[PDB]
Tab-separated table of C-alpha atoms in Angstrom:
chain	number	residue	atom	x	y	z
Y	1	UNK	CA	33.078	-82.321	60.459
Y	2	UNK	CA	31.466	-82.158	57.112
Y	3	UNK	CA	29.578	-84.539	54.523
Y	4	UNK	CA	31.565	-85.152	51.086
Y	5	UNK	CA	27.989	-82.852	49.736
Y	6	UNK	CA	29.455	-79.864	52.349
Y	7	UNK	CA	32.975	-79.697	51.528
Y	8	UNK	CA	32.164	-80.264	47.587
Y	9	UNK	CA	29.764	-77.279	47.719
Y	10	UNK	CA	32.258	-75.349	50.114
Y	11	UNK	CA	35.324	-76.199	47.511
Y	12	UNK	CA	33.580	-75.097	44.937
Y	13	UNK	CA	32.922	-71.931	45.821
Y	14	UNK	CA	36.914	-71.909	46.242
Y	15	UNK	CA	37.209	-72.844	43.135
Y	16	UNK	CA	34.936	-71.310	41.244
Y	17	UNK	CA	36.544	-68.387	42.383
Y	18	UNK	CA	39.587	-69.271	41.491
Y	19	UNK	CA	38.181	-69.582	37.884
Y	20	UNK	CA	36.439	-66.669	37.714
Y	21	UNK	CA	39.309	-64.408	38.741
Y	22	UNK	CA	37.889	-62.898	41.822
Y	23	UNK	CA	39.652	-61.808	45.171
Y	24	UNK	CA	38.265	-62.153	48.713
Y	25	UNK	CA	35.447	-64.973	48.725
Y	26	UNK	CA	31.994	-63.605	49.117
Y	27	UNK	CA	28.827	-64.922	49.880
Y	28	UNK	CA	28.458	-65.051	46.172
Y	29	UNK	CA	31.087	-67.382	45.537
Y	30	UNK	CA	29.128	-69.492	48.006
Y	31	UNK	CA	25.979	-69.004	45.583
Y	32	UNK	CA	28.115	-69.392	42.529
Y	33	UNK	CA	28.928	-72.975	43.695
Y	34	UNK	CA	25.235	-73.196	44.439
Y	35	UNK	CA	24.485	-72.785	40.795
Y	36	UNK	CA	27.972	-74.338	39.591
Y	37	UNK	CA	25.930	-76.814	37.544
Y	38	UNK	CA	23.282	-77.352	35.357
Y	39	UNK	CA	21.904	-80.859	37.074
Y	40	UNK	CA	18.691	-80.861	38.149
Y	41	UNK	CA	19.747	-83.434	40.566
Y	42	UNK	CA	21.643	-80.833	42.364
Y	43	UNK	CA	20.113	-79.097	44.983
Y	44	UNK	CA	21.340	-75.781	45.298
Y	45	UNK	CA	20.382	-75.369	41.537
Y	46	UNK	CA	17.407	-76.465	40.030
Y	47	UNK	CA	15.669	-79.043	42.770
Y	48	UNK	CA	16.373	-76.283	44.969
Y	49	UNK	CA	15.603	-74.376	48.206
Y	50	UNK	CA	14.293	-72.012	46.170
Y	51	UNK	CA	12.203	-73.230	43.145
Y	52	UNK	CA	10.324	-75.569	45.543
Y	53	UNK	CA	10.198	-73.082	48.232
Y	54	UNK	CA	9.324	-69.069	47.155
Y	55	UNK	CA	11.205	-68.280	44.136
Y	56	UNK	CA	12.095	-68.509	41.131
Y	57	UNK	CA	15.722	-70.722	40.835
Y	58	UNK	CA	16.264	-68.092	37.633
Y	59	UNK	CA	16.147	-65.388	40.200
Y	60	UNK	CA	18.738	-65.949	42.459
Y	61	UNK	CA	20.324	-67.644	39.457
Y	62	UNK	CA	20.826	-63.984	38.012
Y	63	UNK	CA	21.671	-62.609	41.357
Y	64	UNK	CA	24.493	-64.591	41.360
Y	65	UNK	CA	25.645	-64.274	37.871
Y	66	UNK	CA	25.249	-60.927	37.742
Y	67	UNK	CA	27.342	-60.442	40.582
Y	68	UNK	CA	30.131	-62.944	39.171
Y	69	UNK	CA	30.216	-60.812	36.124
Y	70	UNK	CA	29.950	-57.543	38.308
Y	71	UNK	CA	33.106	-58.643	40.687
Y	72	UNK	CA	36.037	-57.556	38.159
Y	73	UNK	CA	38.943	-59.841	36.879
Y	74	UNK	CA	42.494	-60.652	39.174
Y	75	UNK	CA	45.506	-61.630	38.700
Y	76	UNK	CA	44.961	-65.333	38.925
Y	77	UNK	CA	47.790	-65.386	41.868
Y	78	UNK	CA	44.848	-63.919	44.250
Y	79	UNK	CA	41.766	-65.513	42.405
Y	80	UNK	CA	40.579	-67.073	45.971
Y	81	UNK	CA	42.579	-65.109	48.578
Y	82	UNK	CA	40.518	-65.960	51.645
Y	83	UNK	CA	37.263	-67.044	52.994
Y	84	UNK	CA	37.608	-64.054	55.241
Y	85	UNK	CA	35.382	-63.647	58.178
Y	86	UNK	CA	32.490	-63.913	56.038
Y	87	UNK	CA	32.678	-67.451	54.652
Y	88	UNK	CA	34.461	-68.536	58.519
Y	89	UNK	CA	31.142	-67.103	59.415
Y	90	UNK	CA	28.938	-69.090	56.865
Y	91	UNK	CA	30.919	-72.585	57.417
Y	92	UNK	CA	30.270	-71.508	61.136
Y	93	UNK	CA	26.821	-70.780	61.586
Y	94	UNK	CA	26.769	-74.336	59.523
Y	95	UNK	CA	28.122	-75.728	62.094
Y	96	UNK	CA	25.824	-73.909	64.878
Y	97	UNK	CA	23.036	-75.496	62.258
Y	98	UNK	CA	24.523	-78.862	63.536
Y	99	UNK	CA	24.010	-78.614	66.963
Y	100	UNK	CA	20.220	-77.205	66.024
Y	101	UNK	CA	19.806	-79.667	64.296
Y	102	UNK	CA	21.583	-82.480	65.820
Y	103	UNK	CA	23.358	-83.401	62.640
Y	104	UNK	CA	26.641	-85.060	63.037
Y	105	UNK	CA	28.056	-83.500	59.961
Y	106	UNK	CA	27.607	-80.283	58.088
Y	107	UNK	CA	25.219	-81.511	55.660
Y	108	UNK	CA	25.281	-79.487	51.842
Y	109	UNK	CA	21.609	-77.921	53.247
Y	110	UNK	CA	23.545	-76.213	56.407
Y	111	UNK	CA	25.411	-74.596	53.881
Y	112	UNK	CA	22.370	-73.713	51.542
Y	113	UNK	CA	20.917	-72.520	55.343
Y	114	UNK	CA	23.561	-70.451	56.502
Y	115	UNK	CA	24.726	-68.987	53.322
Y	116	UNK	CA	21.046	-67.484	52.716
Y	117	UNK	CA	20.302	-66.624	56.401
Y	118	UNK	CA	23.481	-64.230	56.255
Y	119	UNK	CA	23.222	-63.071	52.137
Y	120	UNK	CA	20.826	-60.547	51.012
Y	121	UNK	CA	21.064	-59.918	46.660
Y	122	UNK	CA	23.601	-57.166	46.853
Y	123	UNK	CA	21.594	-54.735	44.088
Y	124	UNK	CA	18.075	-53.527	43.244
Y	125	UNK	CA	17.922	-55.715	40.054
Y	126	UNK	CA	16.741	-58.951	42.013
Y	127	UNK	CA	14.935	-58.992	45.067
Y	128	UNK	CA	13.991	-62.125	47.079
Y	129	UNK	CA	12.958	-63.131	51.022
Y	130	UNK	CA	15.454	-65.355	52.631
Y	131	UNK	CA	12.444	-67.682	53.144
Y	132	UNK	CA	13.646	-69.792	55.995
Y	133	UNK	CA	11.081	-72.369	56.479
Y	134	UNK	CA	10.435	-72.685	52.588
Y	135	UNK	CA	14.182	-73.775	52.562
Y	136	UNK	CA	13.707	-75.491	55.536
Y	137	UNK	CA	11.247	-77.741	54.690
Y	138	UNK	CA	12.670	-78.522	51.007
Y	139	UNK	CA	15.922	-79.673	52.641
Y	140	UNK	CA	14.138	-81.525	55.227
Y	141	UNK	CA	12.411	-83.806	52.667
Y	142	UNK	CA	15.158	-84.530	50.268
Y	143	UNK	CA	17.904	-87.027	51.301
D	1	UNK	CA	-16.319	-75.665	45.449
D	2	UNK	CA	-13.433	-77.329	43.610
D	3	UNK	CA	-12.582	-80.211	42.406
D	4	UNK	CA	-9.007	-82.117	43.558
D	5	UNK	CA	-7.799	-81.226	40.829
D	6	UNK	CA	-8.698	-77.784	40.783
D	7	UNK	CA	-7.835	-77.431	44.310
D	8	UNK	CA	-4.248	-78.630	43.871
D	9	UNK	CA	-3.802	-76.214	41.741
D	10	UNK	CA	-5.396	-73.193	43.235
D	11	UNK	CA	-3.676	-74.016	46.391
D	12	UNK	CA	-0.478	-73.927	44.438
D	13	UNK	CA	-1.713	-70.505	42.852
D	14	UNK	CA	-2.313	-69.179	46.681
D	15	UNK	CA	1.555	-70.954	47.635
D	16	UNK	CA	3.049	-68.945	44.613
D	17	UNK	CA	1.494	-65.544	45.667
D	18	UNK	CA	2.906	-66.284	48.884
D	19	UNK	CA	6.358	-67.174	47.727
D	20	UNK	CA	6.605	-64.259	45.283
D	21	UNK	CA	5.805	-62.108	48.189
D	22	UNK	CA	2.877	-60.417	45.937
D	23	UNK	CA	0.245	-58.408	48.014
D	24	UNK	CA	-2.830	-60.224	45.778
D	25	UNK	CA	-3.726	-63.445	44.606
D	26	UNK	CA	-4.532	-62.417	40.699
D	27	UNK	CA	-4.494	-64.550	37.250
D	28	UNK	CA	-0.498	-64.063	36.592
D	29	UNK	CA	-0.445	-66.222	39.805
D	30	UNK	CA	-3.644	-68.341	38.562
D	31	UNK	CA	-2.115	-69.090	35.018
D	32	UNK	CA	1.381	-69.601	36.787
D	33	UNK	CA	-0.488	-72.585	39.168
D	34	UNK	CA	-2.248	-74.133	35.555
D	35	UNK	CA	1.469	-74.165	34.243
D	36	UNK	CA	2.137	-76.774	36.690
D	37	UNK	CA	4.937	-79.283	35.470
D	38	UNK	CA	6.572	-80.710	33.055
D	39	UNK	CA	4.492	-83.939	33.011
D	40	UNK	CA	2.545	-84.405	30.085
D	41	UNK	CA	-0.462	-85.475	32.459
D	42	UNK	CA	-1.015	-81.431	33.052
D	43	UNK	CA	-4.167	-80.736	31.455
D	44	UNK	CA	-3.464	-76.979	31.854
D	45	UNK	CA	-0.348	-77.106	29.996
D	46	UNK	CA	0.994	-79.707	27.873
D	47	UNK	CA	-2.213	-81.838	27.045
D	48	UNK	CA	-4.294	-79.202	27.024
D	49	UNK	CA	-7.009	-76.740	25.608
D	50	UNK	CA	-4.297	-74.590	24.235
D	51	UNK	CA	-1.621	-76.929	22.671
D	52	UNK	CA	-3.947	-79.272	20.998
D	53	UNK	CA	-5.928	-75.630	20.335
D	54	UNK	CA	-3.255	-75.139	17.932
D	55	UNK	CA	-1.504	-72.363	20.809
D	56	UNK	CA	2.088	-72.556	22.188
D	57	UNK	CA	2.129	-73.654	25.794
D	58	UNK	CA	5.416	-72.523	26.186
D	59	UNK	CA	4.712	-69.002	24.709
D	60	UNK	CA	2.191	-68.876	27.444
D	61	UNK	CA	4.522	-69.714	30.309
D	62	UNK	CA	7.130	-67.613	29.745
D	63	UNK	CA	4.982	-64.682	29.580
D	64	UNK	CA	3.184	-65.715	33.266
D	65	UNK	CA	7.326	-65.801	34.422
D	66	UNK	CA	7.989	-62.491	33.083
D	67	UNK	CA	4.952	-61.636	34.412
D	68	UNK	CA	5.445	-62.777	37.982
D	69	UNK	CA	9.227	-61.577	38.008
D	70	UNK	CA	7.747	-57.733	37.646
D	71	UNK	CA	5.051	-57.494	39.472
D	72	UNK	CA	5.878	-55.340	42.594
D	73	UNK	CA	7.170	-57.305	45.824
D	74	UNK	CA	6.190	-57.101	49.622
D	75	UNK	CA	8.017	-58.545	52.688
D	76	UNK	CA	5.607	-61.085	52.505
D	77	UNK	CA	3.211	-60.845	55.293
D	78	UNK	CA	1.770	-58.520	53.606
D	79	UNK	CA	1.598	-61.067	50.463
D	80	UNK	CA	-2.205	-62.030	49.625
């Protein structure tokens, strides 16, 4: 169903979570593991979407770190209770990114695609387009 | 007109005030194209006028970035 690049970027978000302390997975988990790493060679950081796209990597960098610092501390026992409907829906609309695209696996990029097509930054201290063809056409050329 | 040079870069300046949603084209975005890259082959910013001028190039980017993070946004259609 998915690449080792999906599931790694998926997990992370898990885990990342689960390292942070935080609940119910949120979109921003998803972007945490997006920005999980300061390789350039990764994607959903610096050689991003993003930063060859519309905006800024540092922007939605502070979105998400903002938000990680914003989402308060658990008990570690719940640190990653569920994906919820909202991740279900992101790993989903990955998949409906599939058939679009004819992909036979959920490539990292569906991910990137329907992580931002559904997220929005959360507060007035960052503000960004979810610039579908800019992130479009950056995945399409990488890989 | 411009040269190729000059032209990659203004288009880049024109692709940036697009990107940043921002509703004109103005020398934030200008400066922010003659920032270019890293490579050391960008006459507007590492081997350039201002470096070898005795200036810090990386003084000057940073304040095009803080620059371009406030000016004022539009959902961009409205950009340029």
């Amino acid at each position: 169903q998915f690449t080792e690049r999906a599931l790694t970027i998926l997990t992370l978000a898990q885990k990342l979570a689960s390292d942070h302390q935080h609940p119910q997975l949120q979109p921003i988990h998803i972007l945490a593991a997006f920005i999980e790493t300061p390789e350039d060679g990764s994607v959903p950081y610096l050689q991003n979407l993003i930063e060859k796209g519309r905006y800024d990597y540092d922007l939605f960098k502070k979105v998400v770190n903002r938000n990680l610092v914003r989402i308060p501390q658990q008990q570690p026992a719940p640190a990653e209770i569920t994906p919820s409907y909202a991740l279900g829906k992101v790993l989903q609309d990955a998949a409906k990114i599939q058939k679009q695209q004819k992909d036979s696996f959920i490539a990292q990029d569906h991910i990137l695609f329907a992580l931002f097509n559904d997220s929005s930054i959360q507060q007035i201290f960052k503000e960004a387009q979810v610039d579908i063809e800019a992130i479009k056409q950056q995945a399409l050329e990488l890989r």
